[PDB]
Amino acid sequence: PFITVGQENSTSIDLYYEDHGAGQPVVLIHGFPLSGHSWERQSAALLDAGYRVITYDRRGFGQSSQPTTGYDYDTFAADLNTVLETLDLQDAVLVGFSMGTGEVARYVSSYGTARIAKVAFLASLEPFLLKTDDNPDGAAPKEFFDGIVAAVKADRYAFYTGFFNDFYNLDENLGTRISEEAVRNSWNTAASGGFFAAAAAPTTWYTDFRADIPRIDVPALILHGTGDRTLPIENTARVFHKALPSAEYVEVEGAPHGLLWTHAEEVNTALLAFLAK
Amino acid sequence: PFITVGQENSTSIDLYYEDHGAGQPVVLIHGFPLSGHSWERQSAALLDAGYRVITYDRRGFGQSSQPTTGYDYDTFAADLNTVLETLDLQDAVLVGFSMGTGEVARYVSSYGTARIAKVAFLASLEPFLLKTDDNPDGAAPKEFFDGIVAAVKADRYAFYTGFFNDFYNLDENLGTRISEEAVRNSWNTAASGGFFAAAAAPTTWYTDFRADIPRIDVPALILHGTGDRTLPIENTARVFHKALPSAEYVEVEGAPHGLLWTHAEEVNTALLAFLAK
Numbered sequence: 001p002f003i004t005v006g007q008e009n010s011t012s013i014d015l016y017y018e019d020h021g022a023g024q025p026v027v028l029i030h031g032f033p034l035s036g037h038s039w040e041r042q043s044a045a046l047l048d049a050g051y052r053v054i055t056y057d058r059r060g061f062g063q064s065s066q067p068t069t070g071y072d073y074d075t076f077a078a079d080l081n082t083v084l085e086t087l088d089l090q091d092a093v094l095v096g097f098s099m100g101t102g103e104v105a106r107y108v109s110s111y112g113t114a115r116i117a118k119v120a121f122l123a124s125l126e127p128f129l130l131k132t133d134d135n136p137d138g139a140a141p142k143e144f145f146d147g148i149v150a151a152v153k154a155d156r157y158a159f160y161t162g163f164f165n166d167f168y169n170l171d172e173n174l175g176t177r178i179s180e181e182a183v184r185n186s187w188n189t190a191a192s193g194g195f196f197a198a199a200a201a202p203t204t205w206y207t208d209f210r211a212d213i214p215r216i217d218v219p220a221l222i223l224h225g226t227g228d229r230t231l232p233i234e235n236t237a238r239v240f241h242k243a244l245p246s247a248e249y250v251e252v253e254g255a256p257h258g259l260l261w262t263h264a265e266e267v268n269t270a271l272l273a274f275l276a277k
Numbered sequence: 278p279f280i281t282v283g284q285e286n287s288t289s290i291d292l293y294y295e296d297h298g299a300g301q302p303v304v305l306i307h308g309f310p311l312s313g314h315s316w317e318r319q320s321a322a323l324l325d326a327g328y329r330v331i332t333y334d335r336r337g338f339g340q341s342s343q344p345t346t347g348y349d350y351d352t353f354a355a356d357l358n359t360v361l362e363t364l365d366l367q368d369a370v371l372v373g374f375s376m377g378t379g380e381v382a383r384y385v386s387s388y389g390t391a392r393i394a395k396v397a398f399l400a401s402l403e404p405f406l407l408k409t410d411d412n413p414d415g416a417a418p419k420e421f422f423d424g425i426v427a428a429v430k431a432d433r434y435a436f437y438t439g440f441f442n443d444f445y446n447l448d449e450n451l452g453t454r455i456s457e458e459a460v461r462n463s464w465n466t467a468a469s470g471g472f473f474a475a476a477a478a479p480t481t482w483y484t485d486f487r488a489d490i491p492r493i494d495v496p497a498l499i500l501h502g503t504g505d506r507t508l509p510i511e512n513t514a515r516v517f518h519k520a521l522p523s524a525e526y527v528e529v530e531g532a533p534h535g536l537l538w539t540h541a542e543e544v545n546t547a548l549l550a551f552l553a554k
Contacts, residue, residue: 142325203327
């Protein structure tokens with residue numbers, strides 16, 4: 001199913017979405033370079049507990065259109081606004097993973113929380129990943145992120161292999177918490193995304209969200225793995241909790257960045273306990 | 278890389294240019310007696326902000342050909358037009374520094390703004406530097422500029438030393454805002470320029486741009502250092518602002534003429550804020 005969010009030359013920009021179940025609506029917003037299907041272990045658990053699950057594919061990923069324009073968080077939050085207004089959702093829960101935590105913060109900051117009951121940030125970008133003079137808590141200087149963009153442009157197909165090794169901590173988890181076949185599915189999903197979006201998306205990861213955080217005025221959950229090699233917990237979740245001290249905060253011991261699949265039981269228990277409040 | 282703009286006797290007149298990055302095109306036009314490389318601190322900030330940066334060396338300067346013809350702003354604006362048409366730039370921003378502010382005004386006036394989104398004038402010449410009866414705000418009479426031409430023809434190499442002393446306010450900035458080595462690099466760039474252009478360029482500085490100013494019909498930024506010894510702020514920017522009151526106007530306190538290097542942070546902050554609007 002599709003929702004039109006804009007136009008590119010002679011074409012429309014359409015996002016693929018699904019809408020399943022009945023109950024309070026929970027909108028799940030995926031990370032790079034996957035799609036809304038990457039939440040399948042959470043979606044199954046939310047359906048089993050009586051929630052309505054809405055997933056959608058960010059522009060440039062999964063089955064959504066592949067424009068070469070709009071790779072920035074104001075556009076991504078405007079796309080999310082169009083989805084919520086089109087479905088006319090009320091009392092909704094927004095759940096972001098990795099890049100998806102940027103949509104949650106910028107949407108709440110720019111559009112407010114009239115339709116939102118709770119938010120949850122899993123494997124968060126916040127507050128601001130760049131290590132700069134005014135942000136000594138950042139994870140790395142800009143040249144580090146510039147190097148990832150350059151690796152994607154060089155050969156995105158080979159880039160994804162190396163990327164998924166550190167996304168899932170395959171040296172620790174292949175054969176126990178993730179199979180070779182589930183990694184192959186992730187690679188196929190990545191390769192189906194648009195070439196321009198693959199290289200443009202990492203430029204948005206170091207967006208500054210520090211002015212968005214004070215606008216979060218609904219109950220929130222911050223959850224992160226302590227073995228996350230992509231977004232180190234010391235520069236993201238631990239400092240984000242200091243900026244949003246009313247949030248419930250969970251560290252999942254030893255989990256990698258790709259913890260929706262490897263540590264689905266740990267994530268699902270924490271997520272459902274939060275949604276029950 | 279080169280773009281051909283004309284013919285001199287048996288040779289073509291080619292301008293050196295570079296084209297880096299991706300996004301909205303920003304064309305940077307340098308001052309005397311330097312080259313496109315003098316914008317390196319601005320170029321680095323614009324590439325990091327996600328713009329496409331185009332620089333070129335004016336005829337007779339840098340790595341461009343060194344003809345003994347065409348040192349006048351109608352030709353200089355025609356050279357710029359060839360660059361814009363050759364690359365097919367659209368929605369472009371024109372940024373001029375010192376002499377470069379003459380190309381921006383004359384180009385917009387003569388050719389119009391079909392290809393141009395915004396313009397920026399740093400350390401401007403405008404509106405008319407010559408002190409005359411109909412222009413009491415001018416900075417000096419013709420005999421002063423005739424003196425500069427004579428001094429360059431007497432020994433341009435020694436002339437550059439004195440010129441850079443006052444271009445950078447080295448009595449105050451040497452060793453803190455500019456290194457001896459950065460001044461040495463400017464002197465080598467000046468000495469690599471053509472001997473004819475070095476003495477012909479000063480005659481163009483007092484061109485009258487008063488009839489060009491009313492044709493600027495896109496958003497404009499005017500920026501000038503208050504310590505500019507080369508182009509006195511009271512005879513340039515302060516009178517230019519009165520003639521184009523809709524422009525964003527920025528005075529950088531204590532900065533000299535060569536403020537692209539000595540006050541790069543202040544210049545870059547103002548320029549990126551202007552481009553983001």
